[PDB]
Amino acid sequence: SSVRFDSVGGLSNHIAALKEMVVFPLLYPEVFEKFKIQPPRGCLFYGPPGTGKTLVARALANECSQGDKRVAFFMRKGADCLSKWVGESERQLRLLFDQAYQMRPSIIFFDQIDGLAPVRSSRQDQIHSSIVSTLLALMDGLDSRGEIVVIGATNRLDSIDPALRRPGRFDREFLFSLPDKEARKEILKIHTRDWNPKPLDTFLEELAENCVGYCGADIKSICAEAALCALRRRYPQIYTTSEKLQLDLSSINISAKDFEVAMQKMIPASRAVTSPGQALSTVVKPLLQNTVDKILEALQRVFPHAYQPMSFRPRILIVGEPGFGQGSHLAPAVIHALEKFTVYTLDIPVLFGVSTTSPEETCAQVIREAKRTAPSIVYVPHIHVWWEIVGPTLKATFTTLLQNIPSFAPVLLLATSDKPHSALPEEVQELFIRDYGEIFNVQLPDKEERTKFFEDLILKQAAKPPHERLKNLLKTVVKKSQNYNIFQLENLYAVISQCIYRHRKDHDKTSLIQKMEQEVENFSCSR
Amino acid sequence: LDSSVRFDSVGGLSNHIAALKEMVVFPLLYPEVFEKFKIQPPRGCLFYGPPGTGKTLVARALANECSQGDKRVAFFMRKGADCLSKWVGESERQLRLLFDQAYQMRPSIIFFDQIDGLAPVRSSRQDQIHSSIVSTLLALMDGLDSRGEIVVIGATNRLDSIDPALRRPGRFDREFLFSLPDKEARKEILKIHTRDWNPKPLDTFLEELAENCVGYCGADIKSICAEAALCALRRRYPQIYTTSEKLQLDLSSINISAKDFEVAMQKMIPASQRATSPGQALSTVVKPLLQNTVDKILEALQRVFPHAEYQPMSFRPRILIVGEPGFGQGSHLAPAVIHALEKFTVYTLDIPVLFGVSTTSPEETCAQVIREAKRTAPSIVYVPHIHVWWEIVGPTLKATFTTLLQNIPSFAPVLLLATSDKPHSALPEEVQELFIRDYGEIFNVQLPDKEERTKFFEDLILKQAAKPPHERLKNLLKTVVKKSQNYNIFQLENLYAVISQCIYRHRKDHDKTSLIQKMEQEVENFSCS
Ligand SMILES: Nc1ncnc2c1ncn2[C@@H]1O[C@H](COP(=O)(O)OP(=O)(O)OP(=O)(O)O)[C@@H](O)[C@H]1O
Ligand SMILES: Nc1ncnc2c1ncn2[C@@H]1O[C@H](COP(=O)(O)OP(=O)(O)OP(=O)(O)O)[C@@H](O)[C@H]1O
């Protein structure tokens, strides 16, 4: 009840263009008559859940209610205008509009419009058509309602009748996406303003990036869970009492461990489906960063969005012999590093994994959105298998549905295959022009990163408080592992760490060093 | 309610306004000819159309004109459902009272706005109240004890769901179609809304503007001007958005100029194509390359299709366009010819529309669309990429399409447009015989000439080469123009894109011959094929 255009983060264009429907005419009424303007007086909010849409309504109400100029405010729920008696289920609307009009100026806030104004059709009750009829005949009929601002909000945009969406009834539509890296530090700055041990800004600076997929509410919830877990760490015996105790509020400071434990304990909201973009694990990290960075360089060569930068039909392909893990370790890292651009999965488990609908419908739909949210990414894994599991109908549908895409739009098509481009079937080899720079060949890592992979486990992790032969073992294992694929690599790492985990309680070494040896020779990969 | 609308500020509807006053004024102004034959001229109207054309606006203008006049015909209006009453016996009685009051002040006009929510087509599956009110209205609108001389007018926004009975010559005997404005109507409404501007805009500027606003529907142009004004103010005094205080303003540097509409237009989409058309204009970059062949296609079509300007008379126009794959005859030509050929209702018929909606058999859609387009000739039917479309459809749909094409009237002017990549001979016999090439039903495509490519590249290579924040440039132009002799359109576009990339990469450098040398290395390095 005290939020005034300060608790919202990153919403600059929308706020700036929002104050110009309700404040400017009252503040500067000497300009609009100069040209007979009557500026637009309605707009619509919509975006994926948990992005903070009702807060801006709070903001306008709270800010404009108190000040030099006083404007009313009304609020309505989704289906609050329906009652039992037939002739008055609509009469309430007329009474409301009159009521607001006689106290003009004012604002009418419609919340959750989607359950109110469906698409008109004859496969339902006639009553919903009655309400939509009188409603759309009331904003702009024959009487020019005057100074009213109507505001609506919903999650599923397309399920609103195509009649309402034309200027005069609902004017503008606004995108409310997930926050980026910038907005995330902004919001965390906002929610930690009133803290005596003020956390260092460079600390929250690294705190920002690991919070991918987070949106508003998740950030707020984490800010509470951290403090709670700190208390949990501080006076743990509080769960074993049926009576009030005495607590000292001077030793429950907040530390990085609490942040980490809360972070690992909780999960982001976008929970319902899995996002095909993930950060590469710390375990494999010192092995593939060079590869990832090289791929990003090539992508920058072809797709310069990594005066306006301009492109023409951006495409690329990641292929390699099986066991290089190019389809389960490499690509999702590339997407995750390229955040700030929405990603749209399209593969076997999403197509056949959704029933009660046709594959072709969703295949058209996803490209529809990706176009509507340019620039964007379309992702399709395992093409050499994918092209064999679909009927001719879908082949035709997909292969014709992308030519109509405007040529200079920024849409990238990214796919991974395993069989080399020579063995791929025709009609797809025409979709990649590798003379252009549309094919990337992956190769084995060399010795340096190989050694870096094992050295941490085999030197420091091998010597802990709860020794020159180890150099020999390390060099031997490096020597023997120069022609393994990835899978054998992490299998070897797991088997090595398993021995340490087993020899945990033995306080004297030179008991497990032998075991390490036998594991070195007795464990052989198959190749 | 304003007094500023006096039929003067309404453009593009002359045929509907004309026949309309022949129903209200003439029975009173000249009440001697109408009784010469005892005619009782018709007393009903009904409106229907797409969202936004002035349907309610005509009603407003008519009431304004009529009341302030020599005759004082009374006026009324009931909203979509304004007559319902909770009492079992008053809901209908409201109607009778309304008509009765209209009778004592006769002559009168009754306007039912959004009749669709009031008069549904009668059915037994739903409530009785609607089925009773529709009866009560019809029994009194005309029957025993004739109404008198009041006029009943009804404007809706979807048409089908009206009881077919009310569509009889004597309740609703004249149905007026309302359509999207053409170019002339647009250029006239654009004058209308800017009737009083301090700098009066130039006519040619209005023509140039009207050429680009396509699909805009009556009120869209209304909103465009307000957007332009706000953009002008925003650019003019930017420090106004961070103040939250009263400021002083000089109301003389606030003039609206060009480049304001262009920025205003980008942040706007039309009302029709918000839920898209299969018609797109050629982009900025491509027009200088294909304008000539678009013109040539139009000329040939006019030769075969007279309706591309007694009366011109036609017999089953058809046309088929052939080009080698990569010639862009299905991604740059057909949309252009549809878009330039405006004012004809068009209905695409392609795969993502066929198998792209559930809960309907494909043959159902195929029959429905053609039935509609026939009912509203003239029109077009668009079937692109036939040489792939054919082997995809099953035999049953093939047969229903082949037969359902031939039940059209022989002289009904309905055009079918289709393109392919394979030459005509390779096509299957069935579609081969639907085309009679000797009649002039097949048009060829050829790659552009030297001048076209030169005019295509020269703007970027030469006039945009310097662009501050000289003799070698023509050499590069000649070299690249010759090096691209057998390239198709995709190659040419990609070449343009790569040139622009390296131009823009050194946006920051101020010395030349450091990116010109680049330009060379890339061009002789650009071994595309
Ligand atoms: N940019 C932000 N800055 C601060 N808090 C935010 C921000 N975005 C979202 N939030 C938080 O998320 C809450 C959600 O607000 P609001 O109800 O308007 O969201 P919504 O998009 O309508 O969500 P829902 O999915 O519930 O409909 C806010 O009250 C606030 O606590
Ligand atoms: N020729 C025109 N000249 C001036 N204004 C016009 C013209 N055509 C349309 N308009 C404007 O567009 C609107 C006309 O639409 P009207 O009020 O008749 O209902 P509608 O929007 O067509 O109805 P619905 O909600 O069924 O789509 C008015 O705001 C009017 O100012």
Measured between alpha carbons, how far is A150 from A138 in angstroms, rounded to an integer? 12
Is residue B172 within 8 A of residue B44, CB to CB? The reply is: yes
Measured between alpha carbons, how far is B492 from B508 in angstroms, rounded to an integer? 27
- Residues contacting residue B75 through CB under 8 Å, at least 6 positions apart: B63, B66, B67, B108, B109, B111
Place of tokens 């992956």: A442
> What's the gap in Å between A179 CA and the centre of ligand 1?
11
Cis peptide leading into residue A375 (ω within 30°): yes
A57, A199, A216, B104, B380 from A188: Cα distances, Å: 21, 11, 10, 72, 58
Is residue B16 within 8 A of residue B143, CB to CB? The reply is: no
- Backbone phi, then psi, for B108, in 5-degree steps? -150, 160
Measured between alpha carbons, how far is A489 from A487 in angstroms, rounded to an integer? 5
Judging by DSSP bridges, how do beta strands B414-420 and A149-154 pair with one another? Answer: unpaired
State the amino acid at position A162 in one-letter form.
Answer: P
Angle at B370 between CA B367 and CA B372, to 5 degrees: 105
CB interface of A with B, residues 193-222, below 8 Å: none
Nearest to A18 by CA among A152, A180, A172, A169: A172
- Backbone phi, then psi, for B317, in 5-degree steps? -70, 140
**Strand runs labelled E in A26-90:** 42-46, 74-76
DSSP code of residue A416? E
> CB of A427 within 8 Å of any CB in chain B?
no
Choose the residue to mutate in A7, A15, A51, A114 for probing ligand 1, maximizing ligand atoms within 8 Å of C-beta. A51
Q: Which value, to the nearest 10 degrees, does the dihedral of the CA atoms of residues A229, A232, A235, A240 take?
A: 160
Residues B220, A166: C-beta atoms closer than 8 Å: yes
Nearest to A157 by CA among A41, A270, A51, A48: A48
B49 among annotated binding-site residues: yes
Which helix (H) or strand (E) is B176 found in, with range?
strand B175-177
State the amino acid at position B147 in one-letter form.
Answer: R
Q: Which value, to the nearest 10 degrees, does the dihedral of the CA atoms of residues A187, A193, A195, A200 take?
A: 70
Which helix (H) or strand (E) is B48 found in, with range?
strand B44-48
Residues of A in contact with B127 (CB under 8 A): 126
Measured between alpha carbons, how far is A44 from A152 in angstroms, rounded to an integer? 5
Measured between alpha carbons, how far is B154 from B170 in angstroms, rounded to an integer? 14
Residue closest by Cα to atom 31 of ligand 1: A217
State the amino acid at position A499 in one-letter form.
Answer: C
Measured between alpha carbons, how far is A138 from A132 in angstroms, rounded to an integer? 10
> What are residue B330's DSSP bridge partners?
none
Query: What would you report as the CA-atom Rg of chain B, rounded to the nearest whole angstrom?
Result: 30
- B158, B219, B500 ranked by CB distance to A120: nearest: B158
Measured between alpha carbons, how far is A28 from B241 in angstroms, rounded to an integer? 12
The finding on whether B156 has its CB within 6 A of some atom of ligand 2 is no
Place of tokens 């009668």: B122
> By three-state DSSP, how is residue A318 classified?
strand
Which helix (H) or strand (E) is B382 found in, with range?
strand B379-383
Residues A31, B249: C-beta atoms closer than 8 Å: yes
The finding on whether A490 has its CB within 6 A of some atom of ligand 2 is no
Residues of B in contact with A122 (CB under 8 A): 161
Place of tokens 């015909």: B73
- The tokens for B309 are 């300007």
Is residue B279 within 8 A of residue B339, CB to CB? The reply is: yes
Measured between alpha carbons, how far is A176 from A45 in angstroms, rounded to an integer? 7
Nearest to A160 by CA among A78, A265, A62, A82: A78
Residues in chain B: 529
> CB of B500 within 8 Å of any CB in chain A?
yes
Nearest to A16 by CA among B239, B224, B268: B239
Q: Which value, to the nearest 10 degrees, does the dihedral of the CA atoms of residues B363, B369, B374, B378 take?
A: -140
- Residues contacting residue A105 through CB under 8 Å, at least 6 positions apart: A26, A71, A72, A147
CB neighbours of residue B22 within 10 Å: 11
Nearest to B222 by CA among A25, A452, A371, A169: A169
Question: Three-class SS string for B92-136?
Answer: HHHHHHHHHHHHHCCCEEEEEECHHHCCCCCCCCCCHHHHHHHHH
Residues of A in contact with B113 (CB under 8 A): 137, 141-142
Nearest chain A alpha carbon to B81: A134
Measured between alpha carbons, how far is A31 from A28 in angstroms, rounded to an integer? 6
- Residues contacting residue B232 through CB under 8 Å, at least 6 positions apart: B254, B255, B256, B257, B260
Measured between alpha carbons, how far is B340 from B332 in angstroms, rounded to an integer? 12
Residue closest by Cα to atom 25 of ligand 1: A49
Is residue B77 within 8 A of residue B111, CB to CB? The reply is: yes
Measured between alpha carbons, how far is B284 from B265 in angstroms, rounded to an integer? 15
Cis peptide leading into residue B378 (ω within 30°): yes
Q: Which long-range contacts (CB under 8 A, 24 or more apart) does B204-210 make?
A: B205/B258, B209/B261, B210/B183, B210/B186
Going B481 to B486 to B490 to B495, the CA torsion angle's sign is: negative
> What's the gap in Å between A96 CA and the centre of ligand 1?
28
The finding on whether B219 has its CB within 6 A of some atom of ligand 2 is yes
Give the rounded distance of the alpha carbon of B131 from its chain centre: 37
B54 among annotated binding-site residues: yes
Residues B86, A87: C-beta atoms closer than 8 Å: yes
> CB of A29 within 8 Å of any CB in chain B?
no
Residue closest by Cα to atom 11 of ligand 2: B219
Measured between alpha carbons, how far is A511 from A494 in angstroms, rounded to an integer? 20
Residue closest by Cα to atom 15 of ligand 2: B54
Nearest to A210 by CA among A268, A142, A286, A136: A268
- Backbone phi, then psi, for B379, in 5-degree steps? -165, -175
HSE (side-chain half, CA atoms, 13 Å) at A111: 11
Choose the residue to mutate in B48, B56, B153 for probing ligand 2, maximizing ligand atoms within 8 Å of C-beta. B56
Residue closest by Cα to atom 25 of ligand 2: B51
Helices (H), B393-463: 395-404, 429-433, 450-458
> CB of A20 within 8 Å of any CB in chain B?
yes
Judging by DSSP bridges, how do beta strands B109-113 and B151-155 pair with one another? Answer: parallel
Nearest chain A alpha carbon to B221: A167
Measured between alpha carbons, how far is A148 from A40 in angstroms, rounded to an integer? 10
- Rounded to the nearest angstrom, the minimum Cα separation between A439 and chain B is 14
Residues B81, A436: C-beta atoms closer than 8 Å: no
**Strand runs labelled E in A335-463:** 343-345, 376-380, 411-417, 440-441
> What are residue B329's DSSP bridge partners?
none
DSSP code of residue A151? E
Is residue B342 within 8 A of residue B183, CB to CB? The reply is: yes
- Rounded to the nearest angstrom, the minimum Cα separation between B222 and chain A is 9
Residues A130, B114: C-beta atoms closer than 8 Å: no
DSSP code of residue B238? G
Helices (H), B322-464: 334-340, 351-354, 362-375, 386-392, 395-404, 429-433, 450-458
Residues B226, A37: C-beta atoms closer than 8 Å: yes
Nearest chain B alpha carbon to A67: B244
Residues of A in contact with B56 (CB under 8 A): 140-142
DSSP code of residue A280? P
> CB of A307 within 8 Å of any CB in chain B?
yes
- The tokens for B172 are 């609703």
> By three-state DSSP, how is residue B146 classified?
coil
Sheet holding A343-345, edge to edge: A343-345, A376-380, A411-417, A315-319, A440-441
Residues A129, B116: C-beta atoms closer than 8 Å: yes
Nearest to B62 by CA among B116, B26, B141, B8: B8
A363, A396, A401, B356 from A358: Cα distances, Å: 9, 15, 16, 8
CB neighbours of residue A220 within 10 Å: 14
Measured between alpha carbons, how far is A97 from A148 in angstroms, rounded to an integer? 9
CB pairs under 8 A between A and B: 166
Going A398 to A403 to A405 to A408, the CA torsion angle's sign is: positive
Q: Which residues line ligand 1 (CB under 6 A)?
A: A 7-10, 49-55, 187, 190, 216-217, 220
Nearest to B491 by CA among B247, B327, B275: B327
Judging by DSSP bridges, how do beta strands B318-322 and B414-420 pair with one another? Answer: parallel
Which are the residues after which chain A is interrupted (C to N > 2.5 Å)?
270, 306, 466
- Rounded to the nearest angstrom, the minimum Cα separation between B387 and chain A is 12
Residue closest by Cα to atom 12 of ligand 1: A52
Measured between alpha carbons, how far is B496 from B280 in angstroms, rounded to an integer? 21
- Residues contacting residue A185 through CB under 8 Å, at least 6 positions apart: A204, A205, A208
- A30, A31, A400 ranked by CB distance to B233: nearest: A31
Residues B352, A28: C-beta atoms closer than 8 Å: no
Nearest to A43 by CA among A137, A143, A176: A176
Measured between alpha carbons, how far is B501 from A304 in angstroms, rounded to an integer? 8
Measured between alpha carbons, how far is A64 from B181 in angstroms, rounded to an integer? 41
> What are residue B74's DSSP bridge partners?
B108
> By three-state DSSP, how is residue A500 classified?
helix
Cis peptide leading into residue A392 (ω within 30°): no
Resolution in A: 4.3
- Residues contacting residue A485 through CB under 8 Å, at least 6 positions apart: A322, A323, A324, A325
Measured between alpha carbons, how far is B524 from B502 in angstroms, rounded to an integer? 14
Query: Which residue numbers of A belong to the known binding site for ATP?
Result: 47-54
The finding on whether B181 has its CB within 6 A of some atom of ligand 2 is no
Ligand at minimal distance from the CA of A50 is: 1
Mutation site, A5, A24, A26, A36, interface B, largest B CB count within 10 A: A36
Residues of A in contact with B84 (CB under 8 A): 86-87, 90
Helix pair B203-212, B183-193: axis angle to 10 deg: 120
Residues of A in contact with B289 (CB under 8 A): none
- Residues contacting residue B251 through CB under 8 Å, at least 6 positions apart: A30, A31, A34
Measured between alpha carbons, how far is A296 from A50 in angstroms, rounded to an integer? 31
Judging by DSSP bridges, how do beta strands B151-155 and A74-76 pair with one another? Answer: unpaired
Is residue B347 within 8 A of residue B379, CB to CB? The reply is: yes
